[PDB]
Design an enzyme around this catalytic site. Structure first.
Site, mmCIF file in Angstrom:
data_model
loop_
_atom_site.group_PDB
_atom_site.id
_atom_site.type_symbol
_atom_site.label_atom_id
_atom_site.label_comp_id
_atom_site.label_asym_id
_atom_site.label_seq_id
_atom_site.Cartn_x
_atom_site.Cartn_y
_atom_site.Cartn_z
ATOM 1 N N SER A 213 0.831 -1.199 0.000
ATOM 2 C CA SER A 213 0.000 0.000 0.000
ATOM 3 C C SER A 213 0.873 1.261 0.000
ATOM 4 O O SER A 213 1.644 1.460 -0.935
ATOM 5 C CB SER A 213 -0.936 -0.034 1.206
ATOM 6 O OG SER A 213 -2.127 0.460 0.685
ATOM 7 N N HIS B 63 -7.496 -5.962 -0.046
ATOM 8 C CA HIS B 63 -6.163 -5.411 -0.068
ATOM 9 C C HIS B 63 -5.522 -5.623 1.310
ATOM 10 O O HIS B 63 -6.200 -5.525 2.337
ATOM 11 C CB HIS B 63 -6.243 -3.936 -0.481
ATOM 12 C CG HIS B 63 -5.682 -2.987 0.522
ATOM 13 N ND1 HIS B 63 -4.372 -2.569 0.491
ATOM 14 C CD2 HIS B 63 -6.244 -2.397 1.604
ATOM 15 C CE1 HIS B 63 -4.145 -1.768 1.516
ATOM 16 N NE2 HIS B 63 -5.265 -1.647 2.208
ATOM 17 N N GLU C 281 -9.086 -4.508 -4.695
ATOM 18 C CA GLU C 281 -8.448 -3.314 -4.139
ATOM 19 C C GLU C 281 -9.362 -2.153 -3.747
ATOM 20 O O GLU C 281 -8.879 -1.106 -3.309
ATOM 21 C CB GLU C 281 -7.415 -2.778 -5.143
ATOM 22 C CG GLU C 281 -6.253 -3.707 -5.447
ATOM 23 C CD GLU C 281 -5.187 -3.698 -4.376
ATOM 24 O OE1 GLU C 281 -5.283 -2.922 -3.406
ATOM 25 O OE2 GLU C 281 -4.227 -4.466 -4.514
HETATM 26 C C1 LIG Z 1 -2.276 -2.765 6.197
HETATM 27 C C2 LIG Z 1 -3.158 -2.108 5.255
HETATM 28 C C3 LIG Z 1 -4.719 -2.051 5.728
HETATM 29 C C4 LIG Z 1 -5.529 -3.017 5.153
HETATM 30 C C5 LIG Z 1 -6.930 -2.993 5.344
HETATM 31 C C6 LIG Z 1 -7.648 -2.023 6.107
HETATM 32 C C7 LIG Z 1 -6.972 -1.032 6.760
HETATM 33 O O1 LIG Z 1 -7.777 -0.139 7.489
HETATM 34 C C8 LIG Z 1 -5.424 -0.985 6.583
HETATM 35 N N1 LIG Z 1 -2.555 -0.674 4.907
HETATM 36 C C9 LIG Z 1 -1.329 -0.887 4.230
HETATM 37 C C10 LIG Z 1 -3.266 0.102 3.917
#
Ligand SMILES: C[C@@H](c1cccc(O)c1)N(C)C
Ligand SMILES: *[C@@H]1O[C@H](CO)[C@@H](O)[C@H](O)[C@H]1NC(C)=O
Ligand SMILES: *[C@@H]1O[C@H](CO)[C@@H](O)[C@H](O)[C@H]1NC(C)=O
Length: 532
Positions: free
Chosen positions: A197, A437, A324
């Protein structure tokens, strides 16, 4: 003593950690910069002044001050991403997992956590480097960096809050690994930085930034691209949001000096409380304080740098997950809820489209809708729901990554592209969200090998296969074993554009990952909006 390592900054004492019937060394909480507290808040990171005596590296450090998700109190699916240590502005530390016996000069992997640049922790359970370090015989490092206003408040032109300081924290951690990882048995000449991410975006940003290029060998980007629409803002937009933040905290807005002085006197939680009030549009997948295109960290526009080949030329392994967009739709789009199948109506579909493409004119919104609407069955709630997941995912992650992969591959020395489409069997989030994601991370970190975690035998095999792909690539610049009987992950080329699916089924190779939708997002839509 295997648990005692002397570095250029001082001696550190790790701890023997058990892992899959064996043990390894763990140096947790090693400081790599001076605590960015006080007048140091918003400023570039200063190196950690060497210490006398032994540093206790046996326990995890504090997490950086950040917005904490409380949408589903008690829900593991969401809380597994929340800070699991006390939050503190004193949070610039790194963790190292070293194989036992301590290696002499083995491959190093540095993990950069995601979280939209507004959150993230290196101490999360899914980030436990124990399994990967042990299984793959690599020195696994996980760094930390300031998120939110603390790491990205940008008042360009000011020395107190230039912006991009969170990226500099990453760089400093990378610098410390460059200078000291040899003492833990790591080979500083073979450091692969990998992240997911915002961490994946960060990885690409270090590939781009001249000041970071020399600090690593190869890179892995998971569901993140430096060019993602949410990963950076102009200096004007950054200044705009910085002022609005100060306006939210009743700050003297007459000068940068007074704005910054005011913001520094505010308790951490005060900035976090109003953090989201500075966004320019009613939108989803947009975060307040992110990297700024300052002309320093990033010499020129990301696009021009990509076009001219003004970036680190090396090997890269990158990819995305199938779904995503589901996360941001669940959290911000009308009609979505964790406990229902979230079948979307035509009305909510169009509301979602508007939230997904923040500053698109009516024509732009129409282009998106037409592009993603099946006019033979337009009221299909499942199709409308999945259509939105695609819109959000394609626009925000998949297509930007595809643009980057194609631009990079023109000057790079080897590209490996994957499409992770296996949904973990023990995934607690609803089915409609799909291959959410971030849910490939547990496979990258080998959580499926731990039986207590309830994964299938197939998932353990996939985890081992992914870990070996990641480690072999970090070690050689190729995920494949030299001359092996297993299916070969083809190299992504400008011509063939091949990639593979990453799931529990036998490897399958494809070409042009979502070309149809990405030609729309990368070519057509931008041209449409430019003209209108
Ligand atoms: C770990 C991940 C995440 C994945 C799903 C939901 C969230 O609130 C945070 N970061 C990288 C964006
Ligand atoms: C911190 O280091 C000291 C060194 O004497 C050690 O005794 C102590 O156990 C360490 N802290 C923890 C929680 O183990
Ligand atoms: C990578 O670089 C080496 C040496 O410069 C070259 O021989 C090789 O062909 C390159 N590989 C790719 C995929 O560009």
């Amino acid at each position: 003593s295997e648990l005692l390592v002397n570095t250029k900054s001082g001696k550190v004492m790790g701890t023997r950690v058990p892992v899959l019937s064996s043990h390894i060394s763990a140096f947790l909480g090693i400081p790599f910069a001076e605590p960015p507290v006080g007048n140091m808040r918003f400023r570039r990171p200063e190196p950690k002044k060497p210490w006398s005596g032994v540093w206790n590296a046996s326990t995890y450090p504090n997490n950086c001050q950040q917005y904490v998700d409380e949408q589903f109190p008690g829900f593991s699916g969401s809380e597994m991403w929340n800070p699991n240590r006390e939050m503190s502005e004193d949070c610039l530390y790194l963790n190292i997992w070293v194989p036992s016996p301590r290696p002499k000069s083995t491959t190093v992997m540095v993990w950069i956590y995601g979280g939209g640049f507004y959150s993230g922790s290196s101490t999360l359970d899914v980030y436990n480097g124990k399994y990967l370090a042990y299984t793959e015989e690599v020195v696994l490092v996980s760094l930390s960096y300031r998120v939110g206003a603390f790491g990205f408040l940008a008042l360009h032109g000011s020395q107190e809050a230039p912006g991009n300081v969170g990226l500099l924290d990453q760089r400093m951690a990378l610098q410390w690994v460059h200078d000291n990882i040899q003492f833990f048995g790591g080979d500083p000449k073979t450091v692969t930085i990998f992240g997911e991410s915002a961490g994946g975006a960060s990885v690409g940003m270090h590939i781009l930034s001249p000041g970071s290029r020399d600090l690593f060998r190869r890179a892995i980007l998971q569901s993140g691209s430096p060019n993602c629409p949410w990963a950076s803002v102009s200096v004007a937009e950054g200044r705009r949001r910085a002022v609005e933040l100060g306006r939210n905290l009743n700050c003297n807005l007459n000068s940068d000096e007074e704005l910054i002085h005011c913001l520094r006197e505010k308790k951490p939680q005060e900035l976090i409380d109003v953090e989201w009030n500075v966004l320019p549009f009613d939108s989803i997948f947009r975060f307040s304080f992110v990297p700024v295109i300052d002309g320093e960290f990033f010499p020129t526009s990301l696009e021009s740098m990509l076009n001219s080949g003004n970036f680190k030329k090396t090997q890269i392994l990158l990819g995305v997950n199938k779904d995503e967009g589901s996360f941001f739709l669940l959290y911000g789009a009308p009609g979505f809820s964790k406990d229902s199948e979230s079948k979307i109506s035509r009305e909510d579909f169009m509301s979602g489209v508007k939230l997904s493409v923040p500053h698109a004119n009516d024509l732009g919104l129409d282009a998106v809708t037409l592009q993603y609407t099946d006019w033979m069955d337009d009221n299909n709630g499942i199709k409308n729901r999945d259509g939105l997941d695609d819109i959000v995912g394609d626009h925000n992650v998949i297509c930007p990554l595809m643009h980057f992969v194609n631009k990079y591959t023109k000057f790079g020395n080897g590209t490996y592209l994957y499409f992770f489409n296996h949904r973990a069997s023990n995934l607690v989030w609803p089915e409609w969200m799909g291959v959410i994601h971030g849910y490939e991370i547990e496979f990258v970190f080998g959580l499926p090998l731990v039986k207590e975690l309830n994964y299938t035998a197939e998932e353990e095999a996939l985890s081992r296969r992914i870990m070996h792909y990641w480690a072999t690539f970090a070690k050689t610049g190729n995920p494949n074993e030299p001359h092996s009987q297993e299916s070969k992950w083809p190299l992504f080329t400008t011509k063939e554009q091949k990639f593979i699916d990453l799931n529990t089924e036998p490897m399958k190779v494809h070409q042009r990952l979502r070309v149809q939708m990405c030609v729309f997002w990368n070519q057509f839509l931008p041209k449409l909006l430019n003209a209108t």
